[PDB]
Amino acid sequence: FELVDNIAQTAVIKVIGVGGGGGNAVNHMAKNNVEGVEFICANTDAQALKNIAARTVLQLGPGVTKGLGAGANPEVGRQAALEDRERISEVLEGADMVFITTGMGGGTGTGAAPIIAEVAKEMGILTVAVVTRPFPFEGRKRMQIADEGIRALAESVDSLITIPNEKLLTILGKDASLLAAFAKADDVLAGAVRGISDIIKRPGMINVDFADVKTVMSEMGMAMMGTGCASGPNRAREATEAAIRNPLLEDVNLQGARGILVNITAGPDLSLGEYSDVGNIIEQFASEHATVKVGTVIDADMRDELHVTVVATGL
Numbered sequence: 453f454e455l456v457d458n459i460a461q462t463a464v465i466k467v468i469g470v471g472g473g474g475g476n477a478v479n480h481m482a483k484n485n486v487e488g489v490e491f492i493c494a495n496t497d498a499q500a501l502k503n504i505a506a507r508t509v510l511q512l513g514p515g516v517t518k519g520l521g522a523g524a525n526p527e528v529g530r531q532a533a534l535e536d537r538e539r540i541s542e543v544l545e546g547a548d549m550v551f552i553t554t555g556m557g558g559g560t561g562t563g564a565a566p567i568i569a570e571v572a573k574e575m576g577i578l579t580v581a582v583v584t585r586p587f588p589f590e591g592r593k594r595m596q597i598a599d600e601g602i603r604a605l606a607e608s609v610d611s612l613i614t615i616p617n618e619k620l621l622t623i624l625g626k627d628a629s630l631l632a633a634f635a636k637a638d639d640v641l642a643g644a645v646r647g648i649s650d651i652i653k654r655p656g657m658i659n660v661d662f663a664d665v666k667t668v669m670s671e672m673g674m675a676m677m678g679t680g681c682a683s684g685p686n687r688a689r690e691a692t693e694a695a696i697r698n699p700l701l702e703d704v705n706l707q708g709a710r711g712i713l714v715n716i717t718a719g720p721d722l723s724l725g726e727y728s729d730v731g732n733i734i735e736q737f738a739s740e741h742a743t744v745k746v747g748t749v750i751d752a753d754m755r756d757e758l759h760v761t762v763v764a765t766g767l
């Protein structure tokens with residue numbers, strides 16, 4: 453309750469997007485409602501890094517690729533990354549937590565991300581990776597590489613949030629279309645990152661800190677998440693139902709999650725009343741052993757709506 457942690461709200465959070473898709477997702481975040489974090493784009497494609505939101509960029513494998521980017525080849529991404537080990541670390545120093553975000557299935561992102569996680573993880577930084585999985589319409593070829601990297605990535609991250617791009621279609625449905633599909637991806641990834649950092653950076657009346665997060669998140673590996681967003685007299689219960697009922701949490705057995713982290717983002721009116729509801733609903737779907745951390749986020753530039761965001765760790 454009363455006693456807060458060592459480096460609570462103060463935690464220096466960096467967010468790095470690897471490869472193309474990643475850069476896109478990141479640059480989206482910048483030009484959006486994602487504050488308290490330092491953005492960074494890291495691509496082997498020197499070209500891509502030209503003129504982008506994030507004020508910190510890192511070109512990988514200058515030698516290996518010559519600013520031409522690992523032609524969808526993971527190995528080239530991994531090689532370019534190892535070449536830049538030093539540079540990677542220089543960019544990471546001072547971070548309490550790092551967000552490696554990227555679209556798996558490509559070359560830069562796929563092969564480079566695991567290395568970067570490896571670095572940070574060594575520096576003793578809370579390493580969380582938020583990555584997508586090719587849309588069905590991307591070919592088994594690409595979908596094959598994704599699993600591949602994800603397997604490797606998992607080996608060196610405190611936690612790994614997978615996002616089955618398929619599900620995004622589920623949602624979209626009618627308006628499903630390349631533009632929207634990837635735009636949606638961008639958005640969801642932003643949610644995942646914003647989802648957690650906001651809990652640390654923009655606390656509400658009841659708050660969770662870095663110590664709380666470190667717990668449910670440190671070396672848990674393999675996570676999934678889902679969002680809900682209601683409003684009106686029962687925005688609480690509703691927004692929560694919607695969260696669990698989120699497709700992105702369709703085939704997930706919360707009873708299994710060793711750790712569950714929750715985020716309630718609402719106006720200055722978010723009463724303790726609701727908070728209780730949010731947690732009660734959760735406490736049922738969770739395994740009595742599971743360690744559940746529920747926190748509040750405060751947002752003014754938002755009204756009656758109350759968005760809940762759950763994250764199942766140590767799956």
Ligand SMILES: Nc1nc2c(ncn2[C@@H]2O[C@H](COP(=O)(O)OP(=O)(O)O)[C@@H](O)[C@H]2O)c(=O)[nH]1
Nearest residue numbers: 471472473476555557558559560561586637638
């Ligand atoms: N969210 C999001 N995902 C993307 C975008 N572009 C591509 N992707 C996905 O992420 C993967 C990475 O592809 P790409 O960025 O070309 O790989 P890179 O070689 O690491 O640059 C793809 O296979 C897609 O499924 C984008 O703009 N946004």
